[PDB]
């Protein structure tokens, strides 16, 4: 859990600065880009390694620290706490293969759902691929919610985290019986035509990507796989999804279709496939920026001398040599 | 009430042997295994409360730690708390449940009502 609420923000963000440019980030660089407190961040790092926040690396010459799976996760929740969306943790967790679903609660007590991307090449690239995944998923989630679709409501995105509306139900794959099979079938068939009207094909529109809300309402999740209708094989992915639903309701619920929708409508809706002259006050601002940069560069070099680990290794062997003489 | 074609009249006056041939498969094992020095002492303390009862009272509840004991037909009506691990319960001995054990009426666990799934 999150007890520590000051220095842990600045140090962990400084890791993320080095993670975007380089692999394993040395402890010398950290203190320079976290200039607010000097010297005492090395004991914070020793508290970070107690948790699954950072990992140590001392290979051959490469000495420093890299950010972990769980350590990257804490940074998003710390940002979402400042945006007043997350406060306490709900325990119902659906541990998946591509992502983890965590129930969150705000100041109000209103329960929302949180997605955390767990893509698993070094861990540096893996925690950058999860960054692009959340930004892409939130883009479609905003695009569909605005265009009348029955999707979870987008709230906030932070690096790899996506806060969505809490739609609680069961996935279609583990459903025994539906009270009204025909009305549910026609609802689902409409949604393929709906997407095709907006110039989109789901691609993998199966029973593994559909959730029933009280056996009345079909909910759609997971959107990184989506393709344009400008694609040469546009009608193939359209017909494969139709046949997947046609056979499933005939298999599980024994409902045969009276309606066979094969309409190509592109596009009647929004194309979502794309988805003395200088005043003294300015002189002050400009002189200030110069003076801050001179001090910041000097503080970097003071912090780069922290090597403290190099001095500790050299001292241990000298004591052994003198005693043996 | 009638158990195995034998009324509650005959069940009390029979021999100890003759009750076996009415019992179930697991129950005929144990009386030929023999009731032990502690379980000879639990059927004797139940003869006291029923006899010292007021005759309009079914007797006082007498505590015990022998869950596994069968209900013999002379135990019928004997209020006995049977222990679960934590604290006693109340089990009215009906004649309808002689073939069962005392342990199954002292319910061990509180049944699970789920709270929301946490961080999984």
Chain A nearest C-alpha distance from B115 (Å): 8
Q: Do A95 and B120 touch (CB under 8 A)?
A: yes
Resolution (A): 4.1
CA A23 vs. chain centroid, Å, equals 20
Pick the residue of A70, A73, A90 with the most B CBs within 10 A to test the interface with B by mutation.
Answer: A90
Rounded Cα–Cα distance for residues A159 and A71 (Å) = 13
| CA gap A99, A133 in Å, rounded | 10
Technique that determined the structure: cryo-EM
What chain A residue is nearest to B117 in terms of C-alpha separation? A92
Q: What is the DSSP letter of A176?
A: -
All residues of chain B having their beta carbon less than 8 Å from the beta carbon of residue A101 are: 120
CA–CA min distance A133, chain B (Å): 21
CB contact under 8 A, B116 and A102: no
Domain A72-164 has CATH 3.40.190.10: no
Q: How many helices (H) and strands (E) does chain A have?
A: 9, 12
| Shortest distance, CA A90 to any CA of chain B (angstroms) | 5
Asked whether the beta carbons of residue B118 and residue A95 sit closer than 8 angstroms, the reply is no
Distance from C-alpha of A303 to C-alpha of B30, rounded to nearest angstrom: 81
SS3 A114: strand
Residue of A nearest to B118 (CA): A91
- Kindly report the backbone phi and psi dihedral angles of residue A67, in degrees, each rounded to the nearest multiple of 5, phi listed first: -80, 140
> Do residue A93 and residue B115 have CB atoms under 8 angstroms apart?
no
DSSP letter for B41, please: T
Alpha helices in chain B (DSSP H): 8-13, 16-20, 25-33, 42-49
CA distance B81 to A168: 43
Distances (CA, A) of A278 to A76, A282, A315: 42, 7, 58
Strand partners, A114: A102, A163
Which residues of chain B have a CB within 8 Å of the CB of A93? 117-120
Give, to the nearest 10 degrees, the angle between helix A123-145 and helix A69-82: 40
Nearest-angstrom CA–CA distance, B95 and B76: 6
A19, A127 Cβ separation under 8 angstroms: yes
Whether chain B has a CB inside 8 Å of the CB on A110: the answer is no
Choose the mutation target among A73, A77, A92 for the interface with B, i.e. most B CBs under 10 Å. Answer: A92
CB atoms within 10 A of CB A221: 18
Please check if A115 is assigned to a binding site.
Answer: yes
| Active site annotation includes A213 | no
Q: Which spans in chain A are helix H?
A: 7-19, 27-33, 42-48, 69-82, 123-145, 181-197, 234-252, 280-303, 308-324
How many residues belong to chain B? 120
- CA nearest to A200, candidates A264, A261, A131: A264
């Amino acid at each position: 859990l999150r007890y520590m609420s000051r220095d842990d923000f600045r140090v962990l963000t400084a890791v993320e600065m080095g993670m975007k440019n380089h692999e394993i980030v040395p402890g010398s660089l950290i203190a320079s880009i976290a200039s607010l407190k000097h010297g005492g961040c090395n004991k914070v790092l020793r508290e970070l390694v107690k948790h699954k926040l950072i990992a140590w690396e001392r290979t051959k010459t490469v000495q420093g620290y890299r950010l972990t799976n769980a350590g990257y996760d804490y940074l998003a929740l710390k940002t979402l706490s400042s945006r007043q969306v997350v406060e306490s943790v709900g325990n119902q967790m659906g541990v998946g293969k591509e992502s983890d679903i965590y129930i969150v609660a705000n100041e109000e007590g209103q329960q929302f759902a949180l997605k955390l991307h767990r893509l698993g090449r070094h861990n540096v690239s893996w925690l950058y691929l999860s960054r692009l995944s959340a930004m892409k998923e939130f883009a479609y989630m905003k695009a569909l919610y605005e265009r009348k679709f029955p999707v979870p409501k987008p709230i906030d995105y932070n690096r790899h985290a996506v806060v969505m509306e809490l739609i609680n139900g069961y996935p279609l794959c583990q459903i025994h019986h539906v009270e009204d099979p025909a009305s549910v079938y026609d609802e689902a068939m409409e949604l393929i035509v709906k997407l095709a009207n907006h110039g989109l094909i789901h691609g993998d529109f199966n029973e593994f990507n559909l959730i029933l809300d009280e056996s009345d309402h079909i909910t759609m999740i997971d959107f990184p796989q989506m393709v344009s209708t400008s694609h040469p094989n546009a009608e193939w992915y359209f017909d494969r999804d139709v046949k997947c639903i046609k056979d499933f309701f005939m298999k599980r619920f024994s409902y045969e279709s009276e309606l066979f929708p094969t309409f190509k409508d592109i596009r009647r809706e929004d194309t979502l496939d794309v988805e003395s002259t200088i005043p003294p006050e300015l002189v002050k601002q400009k002189v200030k920026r110069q003076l801050t940069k001179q001090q910041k560069s000097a503080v970097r070099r003071r912090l780069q001398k922290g090597a403290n680990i190099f001095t500790k290794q050299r001292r241990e062997n000298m004591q052994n040599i003198k005693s043996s003489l | 009430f009638t158990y195995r074609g034998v009324d509650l009249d005959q069940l009390l006056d029979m021999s100890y042997e003759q009750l076996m041939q009415l019992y179930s498969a697991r129950q005929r094992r144990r009386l030929n295994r023999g009731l032990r020095r502690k379980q000879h002492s639990l059927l004797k303390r139940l003869r006291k409360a029923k006899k010292e009862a007021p005759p309009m009272e079914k007797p006082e509840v007498v505590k015990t730690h022998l869950r596994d004991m069968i209900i013999l037909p002379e135990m019928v009506g004997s209020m006995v708390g049977v222990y679960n691990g934590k604290t006693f319960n109340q089990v009215e001995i009906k004649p309808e449940m002689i073939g069962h054990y005392l342990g199954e009426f002292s319910i061990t666990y509180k049944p699970v009502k789920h709270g929301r799934p946490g961080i999984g």
